[PDB]
Design a protein around this nucleic acid. Structure first.
Lengths: 372, 421
RNA sequence: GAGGUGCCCGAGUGGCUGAAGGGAGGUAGGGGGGCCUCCCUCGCGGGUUCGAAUCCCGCCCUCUC
């Protein structure tokens, strides 16, 4: 949400903002109703108000998807002395996955077998241990929550269609732990000394798969239910504060990937590809050998007070001023997507896969062995 | 589902089973509908044998005969259709009845409801506390491991853990998968939703339908046990004898409506909507010899797990009217919860003979080449958050901190759980 | 739009085929009646036609733009 006060006080910033972001809103109709609300007008204005976007940071490329700018890239592709097989053919070759699950649960489902299943639980634990050395508080959470939490983040209303509802219930399956994490402090006045709150939340994750392509979705890439470890920071209301936390989030995600031993790169995301409440978004993408290209594995985002005004997240500033706080989030690691890149990038001559040094602890072995 | 031929020739065994397992079925109406359906099938095979001679003789018949034959082939077709619709309506209704028929319990089971349950063995005892013991949620609040605000976000029978204890929960799930994998079982990670058919195939539908949450607008349901997925993987397939047994250890998040448990376990980790569970599932050849060998192996592994976890437990044989519709035999394992002055359930071992194999159509081909229905059994390996309620209370130290057992110090990397805020 | 056929790959768009041809003489499941004999099943269900693996409809899974 945005502050109604400076909205009517500075409507061009918002018109320009709606422009560069491609939102379907005629700000003039809304601005009409906020005049008439001085009965019905009240609530009609609210549903409209919840669609006003945050103005993008000045360094963002203007344009949709294709204006996204590579910032930098770290690492270089693998040196193969055999044709790289793809992730699905590696899995199939080793008995590491069960195809019969599409018959049980339907499409875009996965079931892992043998060392790939133990690997999957290994990377999740490694991600939570790392966030915990890094000062972020570990939480294990549910995957369901009431409607007001989705409004809180801004997932409702823009993405309602991407969320599964539990029938005969007031609950919805969450697509990410920031939904829950975001709603925890709703309604409290937080003390200034508590700030910043750094949370690393784990939970099962669910999506309807309204966003669908007829391309690499298959295997481990876009499945309905998956595992996520999310980073979440609630901070005081200043850009110097926010920029420092955005920087932290990014180093975290780059460090995990350095430990995991994967080629990656950072992409400034353009205003038309950002989504309504964002101030800034960078994507980290990892190189996928078989596809020959870089695929997203993380999206770092600052939204300032846009969602703190939806979820009522406040603090008490040192003058005794009560202010809305600023929020930020970034993935730490999510399985199984990350496994498609890990398997192609680390395949051996013989189709077995090696384990990055940093995970030999959590796995107990250096090479993932075949099964049946 | 039961062998309909056995049901036809031993109805008294079944009839006793119904009464003694408390099932509400009128086996004499089912037996009657069965006589109807089986007659109407023989009528229709008469009509179809006819259609099959006429349709074969339309070629070869002289353009004279040929036009007579077609008027007849046509009237015979319309009759068979009439007969087919009528047989659809009755078979449908008979299949509803047949999915309620219980498996007769093994002879050594206690006859009676809940209360007839006998404790079989107990290993370890109640702890001797030198100080007042704390309750597991008060222990959680004192070490700052409990996030109470999760109830405004997701509602009741919900929990969230903070700090070392959240890490503890995850270390316990890999501990169990590891134990299972060195015990010869295949580790698998699996989804938590499936189609109706899989619920029907384990016996969770029709009987426990109210226990299961549906995902609105889809043909999908959330499972409360990795058994629903696991059991269904081999439907239709005819497994080779040499593959048997199939021993799987499956991890999956579990969700439960917990409709009906009003006033029961309202605060704490004991009865929540969503939890993590690792399962022991075995599919074996059709001999009681083989089955009883497996039931012993499933009990053993779970016991071994509770010893490493340093916990007092007892096995309890379950009575006929508490085991549920398709079980031959079920033994529960309960662990002692200090705050309640009681043992509380942590695992259930259940042998179900071929009752779920012939709902799911799980068959194998034996050494003689005969195809026959298989045998299935299952038992928990470990389920979170409830063992954490037992581990915290049984291992509290007088200052409020909690000790971690020796078998999990390699996963925590510390010996006493450190408190948060 | 293209597909789904036996252990597996694959031939088969109206009767000839429960089924060609190869590897990883022969190599399916179920149900009636008396080893013989009949009915049903070519992903699941239903339909047109004297007759369907073949044609139509719906559903499920794979592949492509």
């Amino acid at each position: 949400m945005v502050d109604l006060k400076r909205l009517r006080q500075e409507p061009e910033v918002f018109h320009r903002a709606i422009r560069e972001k491609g939102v379907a809103l005629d700000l003039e109709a809304l601005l009409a109703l906020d005049r008439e609300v001085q009965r019905e007008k009240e609530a009609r204005l609210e549903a409209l108000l919840l669609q006003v976007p945050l103005p993008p940071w000045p360094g963002a490329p203007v344009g949709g998807e294709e204006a996204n700018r590579e910032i930098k890239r770290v690492g270089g592709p693998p040196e193969f002395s055999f044709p790289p097989l793809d992730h699905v053919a590696l899995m199939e070759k080793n008995g590491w996955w069960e195809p019969r699950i599409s018959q049980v649960s339907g499409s875009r489902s996965y079931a892992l077998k043998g060392d790939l299943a133990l690997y999957e639980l290994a990377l999740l634990r490694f991600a939570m241990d790392f966030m915990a050395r890094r000062g972020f508080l570990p939480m294990t959470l549910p995957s369901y929550a009431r409607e007001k939490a989705f409004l809180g983040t801004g997932h409702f209303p823009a993405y309602r269609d991407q969320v599964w509802a539990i029938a005969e219930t007031d609950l919805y399956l969450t697509g990410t732990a920031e939904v829950v994490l975001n709603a925890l402090h709703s309604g409290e006045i937080l003390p200034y000394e508590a700030l910043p709150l750094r949370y690393a939340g784990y939970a099962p994750a669910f999506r309807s798969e309204a966003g669908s392509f007829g391309k690499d979705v298959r295997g481990l890439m876009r499945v309905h239910q998956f595992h996520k470890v999310e980073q979440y920071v609630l901070t005081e209301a200043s850009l110097e504060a926010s920029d420092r936390a955005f920087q932290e989030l990014l180093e975290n995600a780059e460090e995990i990937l350095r430990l995991l031993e994967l080629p990656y790169r950072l992409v400034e995301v353009a205003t038309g590809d950002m989504g309504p409440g964002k101030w800034r978004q960078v994507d980290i993408e990892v190189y996928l050998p078989s596809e020959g290209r870089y695929r997203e594995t993380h999206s770092c985002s600052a939204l300032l007070d846009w969602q703190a005004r939806r979820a009522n997240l406040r603090y008490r500033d040192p003058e005794g001023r009560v202010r809305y706080a600023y929020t930020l989030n970034n993935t730490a690691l999510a399985t199984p997507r990350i496994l498609a890149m890990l398997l192609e990038n680390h395949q051996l001559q013989d189709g077995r896969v090696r384990v990055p040094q940093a995970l030999i602890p959590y796995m107990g072995k250096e090479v993932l062995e075949p099964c049946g």
